[PDB]
Design a protein around this ligand. Structure first.
Ligand code: GLA
Ligand code: GLA
Ligand code: GLA
Ligand code: GLA
Ligand code: GLA
Lengths: 686, 682
């Protein structure tokens, strides 16, 4: 795991929260760069990221390099006090390159070539692409070594945004070597993937092909498909590593990151794995319109803080308002510029950046919002960007930098590989993915006044007072041991449906679900009852006797341990078999306590059930006010303490706050009660 | 047509209803096999099917053969008194074979290769593949000939489940030769397919190409697309016959089957045509979750009984509960294991088998339910499986085997080819397929207390008192003549919308629909009025004046015969032009009677309309389905009674109860809970 290393101030500057965004001067005539500088100063901008897609400007024909334009941009910025996060420029190749070498282009499942015309159209395991990317890394680093305004490297851009999967022969060769590395022998691959089924036995590694097109509606080997997702992520990781090491060899000490795609529903790479390979962890994240907007912003940023192991992290990108890439690109509610950003700050970010500085006037993303909209500086969004800039200056003034988000009492577990496993098309239902369950729990906890930490499965969730396994479909023998020990030593554990069905190879744990920990949770599931409305007359819901209603899935629990207590059962017509089948079950195991939730209750059913579940674990006094989210950052050694309070509702609320208000948006504090409007936030120093 | 020949008992054993499932010892350590025997014995299993996907295990590299594992498995079964339905193992090839011979893989409409990774990734007309398959068949037969525990061959597995269509050049060459066989001259092919339209004329057989990709949203030649379905079925049939013939030539007398995919919505192959090529007919059927569950299980089993020409047939596979392959794999309601299976027996099956014996712990079907679940023997499904095996024991004690489901008074006609024709994408409406209408009729009749027989169109539907032609879109001159004679000679006939629109090559019968039999039904339709919800302000339903409602489709009947009676008409706003258009028309023709239903009424509307319609033809309790089997030579009669509702039900029954689940019989009254069933001897 790399040592944490954060981009440092310019020569003649103090440590500040970083504020800025992507900057693309190559899109605008040189004249406008003066105007950019003026407005950056007005907004309180001190860092921007440049060159991300500048390969064709920097190397405009093969072996010829043109730096003067970027040298002049960087100067301008730096003389104005604005620090630069320099890209490798290797995110997307120029047309001369792909024309000269069409073998760089990735191939889809059907073997069809993905052409230029958009971006990132290259095979992650192409050796030709790699040679070109590393050559550009060598040249960039050599040219910018010692530049006094460059403070970090932004390596490539969102690896696997578009090229996560390749099915070319480069990928086939790489996947063969990856399997050999993982499994050693073809026999162990055969064992992993259960190939005795459907005559898929392989005699050697040359018989391993990627999961190519097998006809619509047909079912791929699921162990192979899961491994293909692991491999894809590793393959891109290995390119990133090669790029990083080239840059670092020339510019030792200049911190390197690459930008992740962490959001509740995003699982393109194992971002917990990738977090070990950056000096500081950085995220790209975009609000979900509608009711989930705030809470998922908060969730994603919390997951980021888990991936960063509570080290400060970097919000590389987000949007002031609408994006370009949704079917309907709803605008953000007014106040989102400040509020969302301060939620990312609350959850541990020490940098806040947007895609992008100035709204493009041509190309695919011209309709994506920016800090300077098409409308120009006379706009509400620009005033809001200036307001946030001032707010971040003020939090910098009060010494926010380097505080860490406090440890919660509750860890909500997230597992990228479990999400991958739930994507298989011949699971009990295609309506259940892992990822929705942890978001629901985070939100239901917030409804009960509790801010949880979203914690990756390989991290220290088992160090928390309380933990949640929300649809953690894979549990290895090792993670299973961690579960038994956690509970036996006095841990309090929630476990749900779709948890621990299989080991890490997607081999089912037999004897009754969940096969590896059923003795800890004190239940046994013999079968499932998925639900929905695609079949007239089929079950679409199951009422519980505590006034909640299950949808989509329910475990058919057919026995409970002597130590267990049924807290809720289903109500259903006799013929279904589900009437009075246990739905929510408490248990005691060693010094700890569990609650097993056999169905999907959603945010509203979990929020309602949480007081009774918590009470069965001996925790009735976690009761609190869910109309707001309270998030705390501290440096315990320095005795500094900050509180971030967010209205989660559509009506103004007034709540008791301690300390001195150091920032406010759509909110006001009159001793010592904070009146917070919708989309509003206050920040206090204690 | 092949002489019926049923798999016979092990030496020394008696005739019994067969009970079992797919068995895959290859997936489990040999020590688990001991556990399998014990549990099979407990569950009353007496037959399993083995080796179905074992090619890679039996021929693990090119030219090397490894039989010992399978010899041991079979010996172990047979010694415990469990018979073996042995597969050819040619269902899907090993990676070594596809790696060395990529030309075996099928290609889709776009010419894209379908790779290994799942199953059955081979071209039906690949010569290379056929050589490989026939070699394996030969070797398996030479090796297993005389084995005392193998009672039948299970040839390949579900031909056309994934590889029905291939558009490779092997398919191109084969379809050319099939056309020449069918039409003799290129002029005849041009004529059948109407190639004067859109500059499609062919000068020779080399200008016939498969219905390959023509761009999305475009319209293929329909006659060609229909012939491609007949061709694709035939091609797989030709391979099946070749494999069968190899096996039979080595083990004469061992009965042969291959497993079908017969279900209401299933039409991969013309299964009535394939039923002539098996010694006994075998089916794979999986229940439809929700309201259609029981009726459609029954319907499909009836069709299987039609395909078998009432000879006993073999339920090769079904599920105990959830499958893996649906978007939401709903579980089976309690009682289903016994009930669904006894429905298949009632409709004529003398063997009941599931996919599969032990639920897989790895691979694409591990979430598919089995006889022994992941949970193991301590499970409701396994107890249910054990009860079923007892019940089939009792039924075997009582002489069930060999009895035939009785001849109904009503034949519901089903036609694979008419279903193919209704799949064309520029038909009057893409919401109408043939298959839904015979199922609606079977259910509507049951609602009136009648158990229909589902009878394939080439079979003896015209020997029945009453028959239904439900959206039989194709009627050849020959079939049209059967219709006319059936009725003229005293038959009673229902005919629906979408019946008789075209001949066998999809040329429209001109002059008013249905153009070959409008004189028999006494109606004339000039245009159609399709309906639906995708165009605001367009018609979405038509009330009838008998208090039912039509959806999706109505006939514009503009005249009726002097001999006819309108039984119901539409009511609608004037501007639609449908107001008072006749909807249901009765007729007299010769000594017989017809009724023409010009719209889709669903199970609901048909069920309600049935007394008036039947009444016009000069003619029970729908809460249950009553199904009967019988043998006169043994003087036996058996009645199976199934509750069709979500409420307990009590009904009169005659005879001795010989089996029951979620039901009991007291003083000749049967109280049957939901999902329950009783079987009586009379
Ligand atoms: O839609 C999901 C995906 O959408 C866009 O492509 C965004 O740029 C990504 O960061 C990601 O959020
Ligand atoms: O939302 C659009 C945005 O998505 C990601 O975050 C990318 O890294 C950006 O370059 C941009 O395409
Ligand atoms: O468990 C009873 C069961 O066992 C035997 O093997 C028979 O073949 C079955 O017909 C039935 O008698
Ligand atoms: O979806 C139709 C098809 O579904 C699965 O493939 C089953 O294998 C078949 O027997 C059939 O029911
Ligand atoms: O339902 C799954 C089942 O489908 C068919 O019936 C097949 O023949 C079996 O091998 C199995 O794939």
């Amino acid at each position: 795991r790399r040592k944490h290393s954060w981009p440092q101030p310019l020569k003649g500057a103090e440590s500040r929260l970083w504020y800025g965004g992507d900057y693309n001067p190559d899109q605008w005539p040189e004249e406008v760069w003066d105007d950019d500088i003026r407005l950056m100063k007005k907004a309180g901008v001190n860092l921007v990221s440049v060159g991300i897609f500048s390969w064709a400007k920097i190397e405009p024909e093969e072996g010829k390099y043109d730096f003067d334009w970027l040298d002049r941009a960087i100067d301008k910025l730096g003389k104005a006090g604005i620090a630069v996060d320099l890209a490798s420029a290797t995110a997307s190749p120029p047309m001369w390159l792909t024309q000269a070498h069409p073998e760089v282009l990735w191939k889809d499942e059907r073997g069809d070539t993905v052409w230029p015309g958009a971006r990132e159209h290259w095979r992650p395991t192409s050796p030709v692409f790699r040679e070109y990317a590393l050559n550009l890394c060598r040249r960039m680093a050599e040219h910018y070594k010692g530049n006094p305004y460059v403070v970090a490297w932004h390596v490539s851009n969102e690896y696997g945004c578009h090229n996560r999967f390749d099915y070319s022969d480069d990928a086939m060769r790489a996947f063969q070597k990856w399997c050999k590395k993982r499994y050693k022998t073809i026999d162990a691959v055969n064992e992993a993937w259960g190939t005795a089924f459907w005559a898929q036995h392989m005699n050697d590694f040359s018989e391993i092909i990627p999961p190519r097109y097998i006809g619509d509606g047909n079912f791929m080997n699921p162990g192979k498909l899961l491994d293909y997702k692991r491999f894809s992520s590793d393959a891109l990781k290995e390119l990133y590593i090669a790029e990083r090491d080239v840059l670092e060899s020339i510019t030792p000490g200049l911190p390197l990151t690459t930008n992740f795609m962490v959001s509740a529903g995003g699982s393109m790479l194992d971002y917990d794995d990738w977090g070990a390979e950056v000096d500081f962890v950085s995220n790209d994240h975009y609000f979900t319109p509608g009711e989930a907007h705030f809470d998922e912003v908060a969730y994603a940023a919390s997951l980021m803080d888990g991936i960063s192991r509570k080290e400060p992290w970097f919000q590389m990108e987000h949007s002031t308002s609408a994006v370009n890439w949704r079917p309907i690109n709803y605008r953000a509610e007014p106040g989102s510029v400040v509020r969302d950003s301060l939620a990312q700050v609350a959850m541990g970010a020490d940098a806040i950046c947007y895609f992008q500085w100035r709204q493009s006037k041509a190309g695919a993303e011209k309709w994506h919002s920016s800090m300077v909209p098409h409308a120009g500086e006379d706009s509400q969004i620009f005033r809001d960007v200036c307001e946030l800039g001032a707010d971040l200056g003020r939090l910098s003034d009060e010494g926010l930098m380097g505080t860490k988000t406090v440890k919660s009492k509750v860890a909500v577990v997230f597992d990228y590989e479990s999400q991958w496993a739930t994507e298989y098309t011949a699971n009990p239902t295609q309506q259940v993915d892992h990822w929705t369950e942890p978001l629901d729990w985070f939100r239901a906890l917030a409804d009960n006044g509790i801010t949880a930490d979203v914690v990756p499965v390989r991290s220290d969730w088992d160090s928390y007072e309380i933990a949640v396994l929300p649809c953690v479909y894979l549990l290895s023998e090792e993670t299973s041991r961690r579960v038994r020990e956690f509970v036996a030593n006095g841990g309090k554990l929630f476990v749900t449906y779709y948890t621990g069905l299989s080991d890490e190879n997607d081999h089912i744990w037999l004897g009754g679900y969940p096969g590896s920990i059923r003795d800890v949770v004190g239940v046994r599931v013999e079968e499932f009852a998925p639900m929905g409305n695609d079949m007239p007359g089929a079950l679409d819901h199951l009422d519980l006797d505590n006034g909640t209603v299950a949808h989509d899935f329910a475990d058919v629990i057919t026995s409970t341990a002597d130590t267990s207590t049924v807290l809720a059962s289903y109500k259903a017509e006799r013929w279904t078999g589900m009437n009075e089948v246990p739905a929510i079950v408490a248990n005691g195991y060693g010094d700890g306590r569990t609650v097993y939730v056999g169905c999907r209750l959603g945010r509203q059913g979990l929020a309602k059930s949480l007081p009774a579940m918590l009470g069965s674990m001996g925790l009735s006094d976690l009761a609190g006010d869910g109309r707001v989210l309270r998030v705390e950052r501290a440096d315990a050694a320095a005795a500094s303490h900050f509180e971030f309070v967010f209205n989660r509702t559509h009506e103004p609320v007034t709540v008791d706050v301690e300390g001195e208000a150091i920032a406010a948006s759509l909110a006001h504090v009159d001793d010592g009660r904070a009146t917070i409007d919708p989309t509003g936030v206050v920040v206090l120093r204690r």
